[PDB]
A paper describes a structure:
The FimA subunits of the pilus rod are single domain proteins of 16 kDa with an incomplete, immunoglobulin (IG)2-like fold that lacks the C-terminal β-strand (G-strand). In the structure of the pilus rod, the FimA subunits interact via inter-molecular donor strand complementation, in which the N-terminal extension of each subunit, termed the donor strand, inserts as a β-strand into the preceding subunit and completes its IG-like fold. In 2010, Sukumaran et al. discovered that the FimA proteins from the enteroinvasive pathogens E. coli, Shigella flexneri, and Salmonella enterica have a second function besides formation of homopolymeric pilus rods; soluble forms of FimA, independent of FimC, act as inhibitors of host cell apoptosis after pathogen internalization by stabilizing the interaction between hexokinase and the voltage-dependent anion channel (VDAC) on the surface of mitochondria. We showed that all three FimA orthologues investigated (FimAECO, FimASHI, and FimASAL) were capable of folding to an alternative, self-complemented, monomeric form of only marginal thermodynamic stability that likely represents the FimA species that acts as an inhibitor of host cell apoptosis after internalization of the respective pathogen.
FimAECO, FimASHI, and FimASAL were produced as reduced, insoluble proteins in the E. coli cytoplasm without their N-terminal signal sequences. All proteins were refolded in the absence of the chaperone FimC under oxidizing conditions to allow the formation of the single, invariant structural disulfide bond. The purified proteins were crystallized, and their X-ray structures were determined at 1.5, 0.89, and 1.69 Å resolution, respectively. All FimA orthologues crystallized as self-complemented monomers, and all structures strongly resembled the previously reported NMR structure of the FimAECO monomer. The Cα RMSD between the most representative model of the self-complemented FimAECO NMR structure (2M5G, model 10, calculated with OLDERADO server) and FimAECO X-ray structure was 0.84 Å. In contrast to the intermolecular donor strand complementation (antiparallel to the FimA F-strand) observed for the assembled E. coli pilus rod, where the FimA side chains of Gly8, Val10, Phe12, Gly14, and Val16 from the donor strand occupy the binding pockets P1–P5 of the FimA-fold, the reversed (parallel) donor strand orientation in X-ray structure of self-complemented FimAECO showed the side chain occupancies P1/Gly14, P2/Phe12, P3/Val10, and P4/Gly8 (amino acid numbering according to E. coli FimA). Due to a lack of electron density, the occupancy of P5 with Val16, previously identified in the NMR structure of FimAECO, could not be confirmed in the X-ray structure, but the two structures otherwise proved to be essentially identical.
Numbering used by the authors: 7 to 91, 94 to 159
The structure:
């Protein structure tokens, strides 16, 4: 059972990041080697949310999220590498925003801007496997951190 673990920062800003959202794990399901048999193959995406509380739209009207993690290789900068352990090979984890596109993982590429209401707001995401070749079985755990940008 593969996972991706997210950790954010608790910081004073226009909103307060929810204490559940700031440290969470997403379950990606078993790695099906046959359905990830060639570069570009993807698994079925799994949803997760980053919830923001007590937002004040006089301070910021929009929010976006940037993720940081090890890119699986230079040719796939929007695919997270897996933790070492034997771990699965030729497969990593992607993070998608509401546009459906996978995000670059360098801490400076922000997701689709989301217009805030006062109070609580949810920014929805998805995670999935992305094959860089013929995947091989093994543990599939990834990690990323995130930061919220307000405008």
């Amino acid at each position: 059972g593969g996972t991706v673990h997210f950790k954010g920062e608790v910081v004073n800003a226009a909103c307060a990041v929810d204490a559940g959202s700031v440290d969470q794990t997403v379950q990606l399901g078993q790695v099906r080697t046959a359905s990830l048999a060639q570069e570009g193959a993807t698994s079925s995406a799994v949803g997760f949310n980053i919830q923001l509380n007590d937002c004040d739209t006089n301070v910021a009207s929009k929010a976006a999220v940037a993720f940081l993690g090890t890119a699986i290789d230079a040719g796939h900068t929007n695919v997270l590498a897996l933790q070492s352990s034997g771990s699965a090979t030729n497969v990593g984890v992607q993070i998608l925003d509401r546009t459906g596109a996978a995000l670059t993982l360098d801490g400076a590429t922000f997701s689709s801007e989301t217009t805030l209401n006062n109070g609580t707001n949810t920014i929805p995401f998805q995670a999935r496997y992305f094959a860089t070749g013929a995947a091989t079985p093994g543990a599939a755990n990834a990690d990323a951190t995130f930061k919220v940008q307000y405008q």
